[PDB]
Short mmCIF file of N, CA and C in Angstrom, two decimals:
data_model
loop_
_atom_site.label_atom_id
_atom_site.label_comp_id
_atom_site.label_asym_id
_atom_site.label_seq_id
_atom_site.Cartn_x
_atom_site.Cartn_y
_atom_site.Cartn_z
N UNK A 4 0.88 -1.22 0.02
CA UNK A 4 0.22 0.26 0.07
C UNK A 4 0.37 0.96 0.04
N UNK A 5 0.91 2.12 -0.72
CA UNK A 5 1.91 3.17 -1.14
C UNK A 5 0.97 4.35 -0.19
N UNK A 6 2.11 4.80 0.80
CA UNK A 6 1.46 5.73 1.44
C UNK A 6 1.93 7.02 1.51
N UNK A 7 2.93 7.57 0.48
CA UNK A 7 3.52 9.07 0.51
C UNK A 7 3.93 8.70 -1.27
N UNK A 8 3.77 10.58 -1.60
CA UNK A 8 4.39 10.12 -2.57
C UNK A 8 5.44 11.85 -2.39
N UNK A 9 6.92 11.67 -3.20
CA UNK A 9 7.79 12.94 -2.89
C UNK A 9 7.57 13.89 -3.88
N UNK A 10 7.69 14.60 -2.93
CA UNK A 10 7.63 16.33 -3.77
C UNK A 10 8.68 17.06 -3.94
N UNK A 11 9.86 16.20 -3.88
CA UNK A 11 11.12 17.13 -4.45
C UNK A 11 12.10 15.78 -5.31
N UNK A 12 12.85 15.64 -6.32
CA UNK A 12 14.08 14.78 -5.97
C UNK A 12 14.64 14.54 -4.96
N UNK A 13 15.17 13.88 -4.48
CA UNK A 13 16.36 13.16 -3.40
C UNK A 13 17.06 12.31 -4.09
N UNK A 14 18.67 12.31 -4.72
CA UNK A 14 19.41 11.68 -4.93
C UNK A 14 19.93 11.52 -3.66
N UNK A 15 20.44 10.07 -3.50
CA UNK A 15 21.32 9.36 -2.36
C UNK A 15 22.60 9.94 -2.49
N UNK A 16 23.77 10.72 -1.41
CA UNK A 16 24.97 10.41 -1.30
C UNK A 16 25.21 9.69 -0.23
N UNK A 17 24.95 8.61 0.22
CA UNK A 17 25.15 8.10 1.13
C UNK A 17 24.36 6.29 0.48
N UNK A 18 25.27 5.81 1.08
CA UNK A 18 24.51 3.75 0.65
C UNK A 18 23.37 3.25 0.78
N UNK A 19 23.06 4.36 1.76
CA UNK A 19 21.52 3.77 2.77
C UNK A 19 20.38 4.51 2.53
N UNK A 20 20.42 5.13 1.06
CA UNK A 20 19.84 6.47 1.25
C UNK A 20 18.48 5.57 -0.26
N UNK A 21 17.44 6.32 0.01
CA UNK A 21 16.15 5.86 -0.66
C UNK A 21 16.51 7.10 -1.95
N UNK A 22 16.56 6.64 -3.25
CA UNK A 22 16.32 7.80 -4.74
C UNK A 22 14.87 7.86 -4.80
N UNK A 23 14.67 9.12 -5.00
CA UNK A 23 12.99 9.73 -5.24
C UNK A 23 13.19 10.30 -6.63
N UNK A 24 12.72 10.52 -7.46
CA UNK A 24 12.27 11.55 -8.07
C UNK A 24 10.58 12.12 -7.45
N UNK A 25 10.78 13.31 -8.34
CA UNK A 25 9.60 14.06 -8.19
C UNK A 25 8.26 12.85 -8.51
N UNK A 26 7.01 13.24 -7.66
CA UNK A 26 6.07 12.03 -7.78
C UNK A 26 5.87 10.98 -7.42
N UNK A 27 7.06 10.46 -7.33
CA UNK A 27 7.30 8.77 -6.98
C UNK A 27 6.49 8.40 -5.84
N UNK A 28 6.12 7.58 -5.90
CA UNK A 28 4.70 6.29 -5.08
C UNK A 28 5.86 5.63 -3.94
N UNK A 29 5.76 5.71 -2.61
CA UNK A 29 6.65 5.74 -1.52
C UNK A 29 5.52 4.49 -0.97
N UNK A 30 6.20 3.72 -0.22
CA UNK A 30 5.68 2.91 0.66
C UNK A 30 6.45 3.53 2.28
N UNK A 31 5.86 4.19 2.84
CA UNK A 31 7.10 4.88 4.29
C UNK A 31 6.75 3.07 5.37
N UNK A 32 7.52 2.14 5.40
CA UNK A 32 7.78 1.21 6.28
C UNK A 32 8.11 2.09 7.94
N UNK A 33 8.83 2.85 8.24
CA UNK A 33 9.02 3.13 9.70
C UNK A 33 10.08 4.59 9.32
N UNK A 34 9.99 4.97 10.60
CA UNK A 34 11.04 6.47 10.58
C UNK A 34 12.25 5.98 11.78
N UNK A 35 13.41 5.74 10.78
CA UNK A 35 14.66 5.04 11.69
C UNK A 35 14.93 6.83 12.78
N UNK A 36 15.91 6.59 11.95
CA UNK A 36 16.80 8.27 12.51
C UNK A 36 15.86 9.52 12.86
N UNK A 37 15.21 10.30 13.52
CA UNK A 37 14.59 11.37 13.77
C UNK A 37 14.25 12.18 12.45
N UNK A 38 13.21 11.63 11.80
CA UNK A 38 12.64 12.32 10.08
C UNK A 38 13.07 11.88 9.15
N UNK A 39 14.01 10.48 9.68
CA UNK A 39 14.24 9.40 8.10
C UNK A 39 13.07 8.70 8.33
N UNK A 40 12.85 8.40 7.43
CA UNK A 40 11.66 7.77 6.78
C UNK A 40 12.44 6.50 5.90
N UNK A 41 12.32 5.22 6.35
CA UNK A 41 12.51 3.92 5.28
C UNK A 41 11.64 3.69 4.45
N UNK A 42 11.87 3.56 3.61
CA UNK A 42 10.24 3.27 2.77
C UNK A 42 11.11 2.63 0.91
N UNK A 43 10.31 1.96 0.94
CA UNK A 43 10.04 1.07 -0.46
C UNK A 43 9.39 2.39 -2.04
N UNK A 44 10.61 2.93 -2.94
CA UNK A 44 10.35 3.32 -4.22
C UNK A 44 9.30 2.15 -4.57
N UNK A 45 8.15 2.62 -5.01
CA UNK A 45 7.37 1.52 -5.66
C UNK A 45 7.49 1.07 -7.03
N UNK A 46 7.77 2.65 -7.85
CA UNK A 46 8.39 2.89 -9.16
C UNK A 46 9.39 2.14 -9.47
N UNK A 47 10.73 2.44 -8.20
CA UNK A 47 12.05 1.74 -8.75
C UNK A 47 12.02 0.62 -8.74
N UNK A 48 11.23 -0.19 -7.59
CA UNK A 48 11.73 -1.01 -6.49
C UNK A 48 12.97 -0.83 -5.44
N UNK A 49 13.39 0.13 -5.31
CA UNK A 49 14.14 0.23 -4.46
C UNK A 49 13.77 0.89 -2.50
N UNK A 50 15.00 0.18 -1.98
CA UNK A 50 14.15 0.47 -0.56
C UNK A 50 15.64 1.30 0.00
N UNK A 51 15.27 2.36 0.90
CA UNK A 51 16.31 2.52 1.70
C UNK A 51 15.75 3.91 2.79
N UNK A 52 16.23 4.66 3.00
CA UNK A 52 16.07 6.09 4.21
C UNK A 52 16.38 7.09 3.26
N UNK A 53 15.40 8.20 3.50
CA UNK A 53 15.51 9.73 2.93
C UNK A 53 14.70 10.35 4.43
N UNK A 54 15.16 11.84 3.70
CA UNK A 54 14.53 12.58 4.72
C UNK A 54 13.36 13.25 4.54
N UNK A 55 12.03 12.56 6.20
CA UNK A 55 10.73 12.87 6.11
C UNK A 55 10.43 13.64 5.20
N UNK A 56 10.69 14.97 5.19
CA UNK A 56 9.78 15.89 4.06
C UNK A 56 10.11 15.51 3.22
N UNK A 57 10.52 14.99 2.38
CA UNK A 57 10.56 14.98 0.48
C UNK A 57 9.45 14.35 0.13
N UNK A 58 8.18 13.65 1.48
CA UNK A 58 7.50 12.65 0.80
C UNK A 58 6.10 13.19 1.61
N UNK A 59 5.07 13.19 0.61
CA UNK A 59 3.83 13.57 1.36
C UNK A 59 2.96 12.61 2.14
N UNK A 60 2.13 12.59 2.62
CA UNK A 60 1.35 11.32 2.98
C UNK A 60 -0.55 11.35 1.77
N UNK A 61 0.19 10.43 1.51
CA UNK A 61 -1.45 9.95 0.06
C UNK A 61 -2.23 9.38 0.45
N UNK A 62 -3.47 9.15 0.29
CA UNK A 62 -4.53 7.76 0.70
C UNK A 62 -3.82 6.44 0.29
N UNK A 63 -3.34 6.58 -0.81
CA UNK A 63 -3.25 5.37 -1.66
C UNK A 63 -4.76 4.29 -1.47
N UNK B 4 27.27 36.44 5.88
CA UNK B 4 26.55 37.11 4.95
C UNK B 4 25.36 35.69 4.62
N UNK B 5 24.71 35.55 5.89
CA UNK B 5 23.64 34.41 5.28
C UNK B 5 22.86 34.22 4.11
N UNK B 6 22.63 32.92 3.47
CA UNK B 6 22.37 33.14 2.20
C UNK B 6 20.94 32.37 2.07
N UNK B 7 20.59 31.83 3.22
CA UNK B 7 19.86 30.37 3.56
C UNK B 7 18.79 30.38 4.97
N UNK B 8 17.99 29.98 4.38
CA UNK B 8 17.42 29.97 5.80
C UNK B 8 16.59 28.07 6.15
N UNK B 9 16.82 27.61 6.98
CA UNK B 9 16.68 26.29 7.17
C UNK B 9 14.78 25.95 7.73
N UNK B 10 14.24 25.21 6.22
CA UNK B 10 12.94 25.07 6.99
C UNK B 10 12.02 23.81 7.31
N UNK B 11 12.86 23.00 7.20
CA UNK B 11 12.81 21.76 7.85
C UNK B 11 13.90 21.19 9.25
N UNK B 12 12.88 20.35 10.15
CA UNK B 12 13.73 19.94 10.77
C UNK B 12 14.79 18.94 10.43
N UNK B 13 16.28 18.77 10.24
CA UNK B 13 17.23 17.53 10.23
C UNK B 13 17.57 17.40 10.98
N UNK B 14 17.57 15.47 11.10
CA UNK B 14 18.85 15.21 12.66
C UNK B 14 20.17 14.65 11.21
N UNK B 15 21.08 14.72 11.77
CA UNK B 15 21.65 13.85 10.79
C UNK B 15 21.69 12.66 11.55
N UNK B 16 21.69 11.41 10.15
CA UNK B 16 22.19 10.34 10.34
C UNK B 16 23.19 9.80 9.95
N UNK B 17 23.98 10.57 9.52
CA UNK B 17 25.49 10.29 8.35
C UNK B 17 26.52 11.15 9.18
N UNK B 18 27.67 10.84 8.89
CA UNK B 18 28.68 12.08 9.45
C UNK B 18 29.17 13.45 8.83
N UNK B 19 28.40 13.22 8.08
CA UNK B 19 28.55 14.41 6.80
C UNK B 19 27.46 15.68 7.12
N UNK B 20 26.76 15.59 7.44
CA UNK B 20 26.00 16.16 7.74
C UNK B 20 25.69 16.99 8.39
N UNK B 21 24.57 18.06 8.20
CA UNK B 21 25.18 18.82 9.07
C UNK B 21 23.16 19.76 9.35
N UNK B 22 23.50 19.14 10.90
CA UNK B 22 22.11 19.48 11.56
C UNK B 22 20.65 20.75 11.29
N UNK B 23 20.48 20.72 11.47
CA UNK B 23 19.06 22.28 11.07
C UNK B 23 17.94 21.63 11.74
N UNK B 24 17.78 23.27 12.43
CA UNK B 24 16.73 23.73 13.17
C UNK B 24 15.72 24.46 12.20
N UNK B 25 15.02 24.42 12.42
CA UNK B 25 14.07 25.19 11.56
C UNK B 25 14.18 26.36 11.51
N UNK B 26 14.20 27.19 10.60
CA UNK B 26 14.74 29.01 10.76
C UNK B 26 16.24 28.67 11.15
N UNK B 27 16.93 27.69 11.23
CA UNK B 27 18.73 28.15 11.23
C UNK B 27 19.00 29.07 10.07
N UNK B 28 20.01 29.95 10.30
CA UNK B 28 20.47 30.74 9.66
C UNK B 28 21.53 30.21 8.78
N UNK B 29 21.99 30.25 7.80
CA UNK B 29 22.27 29.28 7.15
C UNK B 29 23.29 30.08 5.86
N UNK B 30 24.99 29.59 5.29
CA UNK B 30 25.77 29.59 4.58
C UNK B 30 25.89 29.34 3.80
N UNK B 31 25.35 29.12 2.75
CA UNK B 31 25.40 27.81 2.25
C UNK B 31 26.79 28.11 0.96
N UNK B 32 27.85 27.29 1.18
CA UNK B 32 29.46 27.60 0.47
C UNK B 32 29.02 26.48 -1.24
N UNK B 33 28.26 25.82 -1.58
CA UNK B 33 28.20 24.67 -2.62
C UNK B 33 27.04 24.05 -2.33
N UNK B 34 26.09 24.67 -3.70
CA UNK B 34 25.24 23.84 -4.03
C UNK B 34 25.56 22.97 -4.87
N UNK B 35 25.62 21.67 -5.05
CA UNK B 35 25.86 20.79 -5.92
C UNK B 35 24.56 20.05 -6.77
N UNK B 36 25.01 19.68 -7.82
CA UNK B 36 23.34 19.19 -8.82
C UNK B 36 23.10 17.45 -8.33
N UNK B 37 23.66 16.99 -6.77
CA UNK B 37 22.72 16.40 -6.41
C UNK B 37 21.73 16.65 -5.85
N UNK B 38 21.72 17.83 -5.59
CA UNK B 38 20.60 18.57 -4.80
C UNK B 38 21.04 18.43 -3.73
N UNK B 39 22.01 18.10 -3.08
CA UNK B 39 22.47 18.34 -1.73
C UNK B 39 23.65 20.12 -1.81
N UNK B 40 22.88 20.25 -0.82
CA UNK B 40 24.17 21.72 0.24
C UNK B 40 25.28 21.64 1.07
N UNK B 41 26.21 22.18 0.85
CA UNK B 41 26.91 22.58 2.28
C UNK B 41 26.85 23.59 2.37
N UNK B 42 27.08 23.15 3.96
CA UNK B 42 27.03 24.50 4.26
C UNK B 42 27.70 25.22 5.86
N UNK B 43 27.63 26.45 6.62
CA UNK B 43 27.93 26.40 7.49
C UNK B 43 26.72 27.07 8.12
N UNK B 44 26.43 26.23 9.40
CA UNK B 44 25.44 26.21 9.93
C UNK B 44 25.66 28.18 11.55
N UNK B 45 25.13 29.02 11.16
CA UNK B 45 25.30 30.21 11.51
C UNK B 45 25.03 29.93 12.71
N UNK B 46 24.17 29.24 13.33
CA UNK B 46 23.51 29.38 15.03
C UNK B 46 24.70 28.62 15.72
N UNK B 47 24.92 27.24 14.83
CA UNK B 47 25.26 26.08 15.98
C UNK B 47 27.21 26.44 15.39
N UNK B 48 27.24 27.03 14.46
CA UNK B 48 28.49 26.87 14.05
C UNK B 48 29.62 25.46 13.08
N UNK B 49 28.39 25.03 12.82
CA UNK B 49 28.40 23.35 12.36
C UNK B 49 28.36 23.81 10.89
N UNK B 50 29.65 23.14 10.09
CA UNK B 50 29.28 22.60 8.68
C UNK B 50 29.34 21.24 8.48
N UNK B 51 28.55 20.98 7.08
CA UNK B 51 28.00 19.56 6.84
C UNK B 51 27.09 19.71 5.83
N UNK B 52 26.80 18.71 4.83
CA UNK B 52 25.76 18.55 4.15
C UNK B 52 24.25 18.44 4.44
N UNK B 53 23.36 18.36 3.77
CA UNK B 53 21.92 18.58 3.67
C UNK B 53 21.60 18.68 2.58
N UNK B 54 20.28 17.93 2.71
CA UNK B 54 18.69 18.09 1.22
C UNK B 54 18.78 19.65 0.49
N UNK B 55 18.72 19.84 -0.01
CA UNK B 55 18.61 20.99 -0.77
C UNK B 55 16.94 21.93 -0.47
N UNK B 56 15.96 20.63 -0.73
CA UNK B 56 14.95 21.64 0.12
C UNK B 56 14.86 21.28 1.10
N UNK B 57 15.71 21.69 2.36
CA UNK B 57 15.55 21.56 3.02
C UNK B 57 15.89 23.25 3.36
N UNK B 58 16.42 23.83 2.54
CA UNK B 58 16.39 25.54 2.87
C UNK B 58 16.25 26.23 1.76
N UNK B 59 15.79 27.26 1.84
CA UNK B 59 15.45 28.42 0.86
C UNK B 59 16.15 29.57 0.91
N UNK B 60 16.36 30.54 -0.12
CA UNK B 60 17.39 31.59 -0.02
C UNK B 60 16.90 32.63 0.82
N UNK B 61 16.61 33.64 1.51
CA UNK B 61 16.52 34.43 1.57
C UNK B 61 16.77 35.87 0.54
#
């Protein structure tokens, strides 16, 4: 189930990060470090963490 | 000369990252094409990188 949609492009600098393009559907699984979300980019099939404010909740 | 202000709370997960509280004054030294910025946090005196969306120009 999709939980969020990316609002801004996020390109990893760190190997544990999830790349996001604008509009990407994301399933947010959990918060790791405060305001870091672990998610699944449903478009790319990748998993990783990203800064939480990059994603906006959607009904899915 | 402040260039930006932080608009989102950013807690570093990674060693190179700059912690941001909302409204922190920032001097952005490097905007990279991967949409990370490298800055001096003018409140905390720290330096590091943070995601471009988390700051706006003043």
